Design a protein around this nucleic acid. Structure first.
Lengths: 539, 126, 228, 46, 59
RNA sequence: CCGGCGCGCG
DNA sequence: TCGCGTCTCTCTAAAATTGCAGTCCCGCGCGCCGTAGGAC
DNA sequence: GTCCTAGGACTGCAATTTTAGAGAGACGCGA
């Protein structure tokens, strides 16, 4: 990958962004080599923007790392504190934060076709399906997703471990892609990022709407504001020739989104139950390893044999079909783009090792997402459901028992572990898991001593272990014909948190290793069926 | 020694102290469980030497010891040399267990982690 | 006080049971029973005017039953026997039976605590003195708990009658809630340590919320190394 | 005398022939008052 | 039990009335439904039918 | 300025 | 078609030797001898 | 020559060593 170099004077930056400063100190002709709002990312010669929630310590650290000009919303005594050559005072740093980034990188969104996707799910899935579809058309495309970022093809980007990239990061990342020859791009237009102004200075061509549901509990707003948060994506729909509307009709909020912006913009719709939409599937078959869906489009009826699991990823398939119909893509490339995607990273990435079952990974660490995923596993027809889950520490203490409650009531045998214990002891969390069923770690450990585990009140079995390692090892070893084993809570990232050190641990690779050597443990006379293991020489 | 501690969960059915090394535990389980994580959970199902004894002493629940000894003594009584000698062990054990509760002594101090050294001027053999 | 008593005996006025009781009133709270027992031994094997009375036995028993470490049940039992052998000259009061009930409760000598609680019932106040205003781990609550745990339900009912007659509300420590969310009301019937049917599913989420799991004040039921 | 083994378990069915054998071999998988009152105690009666 | 402010499940009210009918204690069954109306707690419809049948069977 | 062995005295 | 003493172990309650642990006056005087081992 | 230099006598008592005591699952003979 090639790193583009940017050189612009401070005077040209303000005029391009049309920002009116409150007052100007120092030199206006200073060359700026970059824009950073975080102290830990400031390089020598770059421009620094100070937030209102960050104290004076951030300014001093930025100056040490090589800050030359600081853009702050309030006056700061620079003659005795900062070594910067210039200080800029603006009314709203957060709004100008996107404004400064866009002009510095010459507004890269103008030279690439940006397709916007919004919704409570499939933000990563839609982007990858579109990218390795636009690629079926021969157009270079990249990734702007929480899971991972790609310039084009297979060149992944070392994305920082943050779920919401800032406006400057988006502008800087896009400029790097366009410099490497990128022609199309799809971004995750999450409600948090659209409302906060992290996507105000990005030109969007096509907007995709999948589903609007009250699922994000971290959203600091009401239902109307949450609806209006995603409404900003479609409120920019002005040009009919350049822009297309992609809205799901099955969602009740369809009528609200379709009225935003210029009504003359073409509207492409996808839904399963509602046949009035342009795109609607006709017959679908679900299996443990592949999905066959027969869809109808205005350009023709398509037969799809995709490896995606369940029906939650069908909308992402439909969205790619809907966008393909929107851009008038030939139906031949639509088949290739959808069928190419088999296991989206960080989202149900199936671990296939020629077994009679499947192992997928989901990043769901919230009760709603986990509940939806476990419900979606049921429709895939599993003979027996096995789940492995946990919860973090020092945080989210209020709803530990609900995840294991839904796991026990939905899965037959559920191993228990932690997600990221942190400084908090994992044993306390694992005891908090049993609180939702009527057990405690004291009682459960009393069960373990007498080597017998009577099942639950509904015939379901329950086993537990402190560390996720042996737990997922046993869960993999207990995959059987028609059964499904679930590991969740980590997803796209590959880090482990114990105490304060962030250990490097990947769930997908460990599941691969477990499925690699499942045979020898079971064939050597060990009754790996359930705890305790009946060793040949232990009776 | 199999199952040295109880306050942490296990997944094996090895009980007592198997004199012979377990064939599976020598090659199979370490190969399947690799090395790092295996050693991380190694000293929780099988251990040996004074470390296992110290782990057993550290996680003892003395009150449970007293109650089990008392109930076993009553069971023996409600029923003649070793029928009495087992009783005297039970009386001795619950007497021994009681003294740890009221004092500040810990039963794991009977296994040494550090070795104090006599001052040199007292050893101008030792 | 000790210096002034030494000077008084140097001036020619020997200490009597009154001065010794005054001294014992402070020695009984030092946490070391041996000081109060040395004073008691000085009193017991001395002159007629130095002989212990009910207050002296009460002070020494209180010193022994509230010791910091080691077991003192044998010492309290021998002191009780010595007081019994002195019956022609000494008789108990409410504090004697309160202290003895507390001692025989904390050491799980339940039947002796029942005997002395029957003796204590005849005194007004009674269980109010035993309650100790909640101090010293609330011996009345511990007595009620000891009665409940061993299934001495008739004696528990008698203790409740005594508390009702003494206008003594049952303290929260006596009404501690068991693991299955039960209390002394239903803890001795044939289903032991298990819940009844109740006609529906138990709302474990509500239990987790009400126990402080939202603010991390929950009491985890996991074994832990230590003599606690 | 294999019928004596039945007392170690709950004796499910059994009785005719070979059922006792199969069960024993498969059980290892789980592995005047009017005169009495005329006496009287005197505890506590000094 | 209800004076403390509680409210049992519906099935238990069915089973306690069923047992009383089998034992021949109709006076208790009419009493279990007499205070139930005053307390305001709902009573199952099928439980109403069987107790009505019992009082119609003895007349 | 430490311990063993041997021989003695009261 | 089972039933019957019973072949071959089978596991433990109850003595019966049996191998440590511990101990075996006090106080004085004198002499001798250590402190070893190996390739230089 | 040497300068560093690495097997009493008695008592007390728990520990093996039986001795025994019953006792049972599979069984060759047998009714």
């Amino acid at each position: 990958i090639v790193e583009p170099k940017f050189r612009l004077s401070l005077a040209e930056l303000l005029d391009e962004s049309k920002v009116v400063p409150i007052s100007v100190y120092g030199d206006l002709d200073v060359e700026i080599t970059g824009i950073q709002h975080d102290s830990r990312g400031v390089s020598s010669g770059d421009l620094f923007v100070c937030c209102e929630n960050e104290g004076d310590s951030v300014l001093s650290e930025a100056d040490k790392r090589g800050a030359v000009a600081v853009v702050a919303s309030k006056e700061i005594d620079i003659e005795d504190t900062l070594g910067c050559r210039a200080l800029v005072i603006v009314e709203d740093t957060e709004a100008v934060l996107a404004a400064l980034a866009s002009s510095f990188y010459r507004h890269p969104s103008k030279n690439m076709a940006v397709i916007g996707v919004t919704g409570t799910n499939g933000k990563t899935t839609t982007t990858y399906l579109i990218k390795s579809l636009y690629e079926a058309m021969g157009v270079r495309t990249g990734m702007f997703s929480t899971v991972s970022c790609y310039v084009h093809g297979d060149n992944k980007m070392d994305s920082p471990t943050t779920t919401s990239p800032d406006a400057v990061l988006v502008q800087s990342m896009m400029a790097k892609m366009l410099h490497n020859g990128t022609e199309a791009l799809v971004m995750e237009a999450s409600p948090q990022e659209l409302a906060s102004g992290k996507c105000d200075e990005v030109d969007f061509d096509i907007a995709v709407f999948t589903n609007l549901t009250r699922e994000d509990s971290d959203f600091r707003g009401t239902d109307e504001e949450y609806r209006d948060a995603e409404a900003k994506l479609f409120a920019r729909m002005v040009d009919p020739e350049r822009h297309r509307k992609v809205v799901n009709i099955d969602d009740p909020n369809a009528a609200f989104f379709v009225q935003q912006g210029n009504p003359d913009v073409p509207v492409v719709t996808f839904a399963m139950e509602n046949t009035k939409a342009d795109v609607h599937p006709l017959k679908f078959e679900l299996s443990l390893f592949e999905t066959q869906v027969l869809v109808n489009t205005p350009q023709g009826i398509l037969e799809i044999s995709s490896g995606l699991l369940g029906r939650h990823n069908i909308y992402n398939i439909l969205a790619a079909v809907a966008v393909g119909i929107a851009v008038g893509a030939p139906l031949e490339d639509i088949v290739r783009g959808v069928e190419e995607v088999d296991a989206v990273p960080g989202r149900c990435e199936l671990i296939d090792e020629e077994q009679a079952f499947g192992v997928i990974v989901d990043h769901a660490n919230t009760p709603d997402g986990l509940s939806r995923l476990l419900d979606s596993v049921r429709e895939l027809k599993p003979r027996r459901i096995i789940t492995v889950i946990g919860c973090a520490g020092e945080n989210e203490r209020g709803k530990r028992p609900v995840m294991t409650k839904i796991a026990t009531e939905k899965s037959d045998v559920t191993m228990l572990t932690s997600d990221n214990p942190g400084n908090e002891d994992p044993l306390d969390i694992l005891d908090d898991m049993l609180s939702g069923i009527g057990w405690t770690m004291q009682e459960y450990l009393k069960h373990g001593e007498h080597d017998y585990y009577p099942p639950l009140s509904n015939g379901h079995r329950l086993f537990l272990h402190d560390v996720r390692r042996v737990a997922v090892r046993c869960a993999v070893a207990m995959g059987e014909e028609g059964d499904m084993v679930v590991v969740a809570g980590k997803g796209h990232e590959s880090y482990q948190l114990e105490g304060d050190k962030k250990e490097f641990y990947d769930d997908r690779e460990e599941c691969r290793e477990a499925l690699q050597y499942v045979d020898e443990l079971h064939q050597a006379g060990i009754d790996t069926s359930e705890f305790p293991w009946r060793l040949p020489e232990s009776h | 020694f199999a199952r040295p501690i109880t306050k942490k969960p296990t997944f094996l059915r090895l009980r007592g102290s198997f004199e012979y090394e377990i064939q599976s535990w020598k090659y199979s389980i370490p190969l399947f469980f690799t090395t790092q994580g295996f050693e991380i959970f190694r000293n929780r199902e099988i251990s040996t030497g004074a470390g296992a004894i110290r782990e057993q002493l550290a996680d003892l629940d003395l009150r449970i010891i007293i109650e089990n000894s008392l109930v076993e003594w009553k069971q023996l009584g409600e029923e003649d040399r070793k029928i009495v000698r087992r009783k005297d062990f039970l009386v001795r054990r619950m007497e021994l267990a009681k003294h740890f509760i009221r004092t500040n002594i810990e039963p794991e101090w009977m296994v040494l982690c550090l070795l104090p050294v006599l001052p040199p001027e007292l050893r101008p053999d030792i | 006080a000790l210096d002034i008593s030494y000077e008084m005996e140097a001036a020619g006025r020997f200490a009597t049971t009154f001065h010794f009781n005054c001294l014992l009133s402070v020695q009984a709270t030092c946490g070391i029973p041996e000081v109060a027992y040395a004073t008691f031994e000085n009193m017991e094997y001395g002159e007629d005017f130095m002989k212990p009375d009910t207050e002296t036995y009460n002070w020494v028993i209180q010193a022994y039953t509230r010791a910091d470490s080691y077991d003192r049940v044998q010492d309290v039992a021998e002191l009780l026997g010595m007081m019994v052998e002195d019956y022609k000259r000494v008789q108990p009061n409410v504090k004697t039976h309160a202290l003895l009930v507390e001692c025989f409760t904390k050491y799980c000598v339940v039947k002796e605590a029942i005997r002395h609680f029957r003796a204590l019932k005849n005194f007004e106040g009674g269980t109010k003195v035993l309650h100790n205003a909640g101090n010293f781990e609330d011996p009345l609550s511990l007595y009620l708990r000891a009665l409940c745990r061993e299934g001495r339900i008739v004696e528990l009912i008698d203790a409740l009658d005594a508390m009702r007659r003494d206008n003594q509300p049952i303290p929260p420590r006596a009404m501690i809630m068991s693991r299955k969310y039960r209390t002394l009301v239903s803890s001795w019937i044939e289903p032991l340590q298990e819940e009844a049917e109740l006609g529906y599913e138990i709302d474990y989420l509500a239990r987790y919320v009400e126990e402080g799991g939202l603010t991390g004040e929950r009491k985890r039921w996991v074994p832990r190394r230590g003599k606690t | 005398e294999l019928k004596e083994e039945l007392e170690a378990q709950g004796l499910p069915i059994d009785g005719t022939r070979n059922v006792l054998y199969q069960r024993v071999q498969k059980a290892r998988r789980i592995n005047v008052d009017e005169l009495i009152c005329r006496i009287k105690l005197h505890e506590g009666d000094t | 039990t209800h004076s403390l402010g509680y409210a049992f499940g519906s099935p238990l009210y069915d089973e306690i009335i069923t047992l009383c009918l089998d034992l021949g204690e109709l006076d208790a069954a009419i009493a279990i439904v007499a205070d139930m109306e005053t307390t305001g707690i709902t009573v199952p419809d099928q439980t109403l039918d069987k107790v009505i049948s019992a009082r119609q069977s003895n007349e």
